[PDB]
Amino acid sequence: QAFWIDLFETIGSPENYLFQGRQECYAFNGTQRFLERYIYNREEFVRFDSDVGEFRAVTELGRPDEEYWNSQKDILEEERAVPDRMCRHNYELGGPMTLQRRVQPRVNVSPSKKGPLQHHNLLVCHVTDFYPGSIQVRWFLNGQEETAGVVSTNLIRNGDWTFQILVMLEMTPQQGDVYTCQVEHTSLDSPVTVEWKAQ
Amino acid sequence: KADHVSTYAAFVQTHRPTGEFMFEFDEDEMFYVDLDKKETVWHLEEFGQAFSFEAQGGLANIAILNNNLNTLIQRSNHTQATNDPPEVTVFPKEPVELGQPNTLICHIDKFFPPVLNVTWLCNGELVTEGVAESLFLPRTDYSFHKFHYLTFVPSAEDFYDCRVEHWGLDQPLLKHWE
Ligand SMILES: *[C@@H]1O[C@H](CO)[C@@H](O)[C@H](O)[C@H]1NC(C)=O
Ligand SMILES: *[C@@H]1O[C@H](CO)[C@@H](O)[C@H](O)[C@H]1NC(C)=O
């Protein structure tokens, strides 16, 4: 039930200075890659990479640290251990809670502006509250897919473990036209469709 | 190259927040160590229910990082980074339906340092209740972002503003909404 933490290594307008530390685990095809990033203000100056095996000065400001840390056999072996250690344990902790977390999307189809059925308009497909963020949104006019005229805004992260996207098609609708939004997500066995009638 | 990215990101700075420690999975913050309350705070109910975390790891890394800052202020001949102004966006959580309760999200993005003031404004006046907010989220580009939330009920005779203050901003930015 408990998460693990490796401890960072030791170095060696208003006045403000910042230091940032990052312990990243890159999980891919049953493999873990560990990166320990040391950043002063916005400049990453020194880094440990499990793929490298040793510390590397990202910029010349990290030169003393690369030189020193690499001289200590303990620091090096401690770091090298991390992928099979902390990276693996924490990945294993996240079962269907984070690794397989699935939330179904809320699809709403509505025109951009209120007006007559002849002028130029945008048909908004507002797909909201879903996880993971990997999603497909297709536009269909009278059963045939509309590829051109799709104005999408980049996938939106709500910062509450849910995502949103607005996919709007450029349309000149005729009375009796059926516009269909088709959503493909990992949290659905069968795709969800929402139809819009001209009226 | 990865299926998933699990990361611990902690910062330490002169101005407030003086320090921050958190764990994020695929850019979404899972948990953090309240450094003042000396307690682990989980982003979701189910998280803290199935998982545990030792706040001593949070604080200890903040202690290491505090030392590292001192050494680098010295090494860099007191180098202060240039103020990166934020990029503000206001958008509702769910599709807007007059009279149906919703949430207004304010995304403050692409700024440095993580020193910021954020106040919600309804019809010109400050709104203190039904308000929530994120931590100073550390972007992969060593810049920062934050989320602010306001529970609201959509009405035609209403207007919203996300009032932001940052050192790289000459006048407080107002980002208006319907
Ligand atoms: C930075 O330090 C060097 C000495 O190492 C000095 O020559 C230089 O003037 C310092 N920079 C400032 C702006 O004081
Ligand atoms: C934040 O707000 C306080 C009080 O309004 C003020 O003293 C401080 O300078 C502000 N700074 C910025 C730019 O956020």
Curated annotation (Swiss-Prot), chain A:
Native species: Homo sapiens
Outcome after substituting residue 45 to L: In allele DPB1*02:02, allele DPB1*02:03, allele DPB1*05:01, allele DPB1*15:02, allele DPB1*17:02, allele DPB1*19:02, allele DPB1*21:01, allele DPB1*21:01, allele DPB1*22:01, allele DPB1*34:01, allele DPB1*36:01, allele DPB1*38:01, allele DPB1*44:01, allele DPB1*48:01, allele DPB1*58:01, allele DPB1*62:01, allele DPB1*63:01, allele DPB1*95:01 and allele DPB1*97:01
Annotated spans, Beta-1: 13-102
Glycosylated position list: 29
Protein name in UniProt: HLA class II histocompatibility antigen, DP beta 1 chain
UniProt-reported outcome of changing residue 14 to A: In allele DPB1*75:01
Effect seen on changing residue 74 to H: In allele DPB1*96:01
Intracellular or extracellular location(s): Cell membrane; Endoplasmic reticulum membrane; Golgi apparatus, trans-Golgi network membrane; Endosome membrane
Keyword presence, Hydrolase: no
Result, substituting residue 43 to Q: Ind allele DPB1*11:01, allele DPB1*15:01 and allele DPB1*74:01
GO terms assigned for molecular function: MHC class II protein complex binding; peptide antigen binding
Disulfide bond positions: 25-87, 125-181
Effect of residue 83 to L: In allele DPB1*78:01
Domain Ig-like C1-type: 105-193
Biological-process GO terms, alphabetical: adaptive immune response; antigen processing and presentation of exogenous peptide antigen via MHC class II; peptide antigen assembly with MHC class II protein complex; positive regulation of immune response; positive regulation of T cell activation; positive regulation of T cell proliferation; positive regulation of type II interferon production; T cell receptor signaling pathway
Keywords: Adaptive immunity, Cell membrane, Disulfide bond, Endoplasmic reticulum, Endosome, Glycoprotein, Golgi apparatus, Immunity, Lysosome, Membrane, MHC II, Signal, Transmembrane, Transmembrane helix
Function, as annotated: Binds peptides derived from antigens that access the endocytic route of antigen presenting cells (APC) and presents them on the cell surface for recognition by the CD4 T-cells. The peptide binding cleft accommodates peptides of 10-30 residues. The peptides presented by MHC class II molecules are generated mostly by degradation of proteins that access the endocytic route, where they are processed by lysosomal proteases and other hydrolases.
Outcome of substituting residue 22 to L: In allele DPB1*77:01
Membrane topology: Single-pass type I membrane protein
Phenotype upon changing residue 42 to P: In allele DPB1*14:02 and allele DPB1*21:02
Self-association and partners: Heterodimer of an alpha and a beta subunit; also referred as MHC class II molecule. In the endoplasmic reticulum (ER) it forms a heterononamer; 3 MHC class II molecules bind to a CD74 homotrimer (also known as invariant chain or HLA class II histocompatibility antigen gamma chain). In the endosomal/lysosomal system; CD74 undergoes sequential degradation by various proteases; leaving a small fragment termed CLIP on each MHC class II molecule. MHC class II molecule interacts with HLA_DM, and HLA_DO in B-cells, in order to release CLIP and facilitate the binding of antigenic peptides.
Highest taxon listed in the record's lineage: Eukaryota
Mutagenesis or variant effect for residue 80 to W: In allele DPB1*94:01
All ranges on the Extracellular side of the membrane: 13-199
UniProtKB/Swiss-Prot annotation, chain B:
Known outcome of mutating residue 30 to Q: In allele DPA1*01:06, allele DPA1*02:01, allele DPA1*02:02 and allele DPA1*02:04; requires 2 nucleotide substitutions
Swiss-Prot/TrEMBL keywords: Adaptive immunity, Cell membrane, Disulfide bond, Endoplasmic reticulum, Endosome, Glycoprotein, Golgi apparatus, Immunity, Lysosome, Membrane, MHC II, Signal, Transmembrane, Transmembrane helix
Membrane topology listed for this record: Single-pass type I membrane protein
Domain Ig-like C1-type: 86-178
Cellular compartment(s): Cell membrane; Endoplasmic reticulum membrane; Golgi apparatus, trans-Golgi network membrane; Endosome membrane
Residue ranges, annotated region (Alpha-2): 84-177
GO biological process, one term: antigen processing and presentation of exogenous peptide antigen via MHC class II
Effect of substituting residue 110 to R: In allele DPA1*02:01 and allele DPA1*02:02
Primary localization: membrane
Stretches assigned to the Extracellular side: 1-178
Annotated S-S bridges: 106-162
Annotated effect of mutating residue 159 to V: In allele DPA1*02:01, allele DPA1*02:02 and allele DPA1*04:01
Protein function: Binds peptides derived from antigens that access the endocytic route of antigen presenting cells (APC) and presents them on the cell surface for recognition by the CD4 T-cells. The peptide binding cleft accommodates peptides of 10-30 residues. The peptides presented by MHC class II molecules are generated mostly by degradation of proteins that access the endocytic route, where they are processed by lysosomal proteases and other hydrolases.
Family (UniProt): Belongs to the MHC class II family.
Protein name listed in UniProt: HLA class II histocompatibility antigen, DP alpha 1 chain
Species this protein is from: Homo sapiens (Human)
Gene name per UniProt: HLA-DPA1
Residues of the full protein shown: 33 to 210 of 260
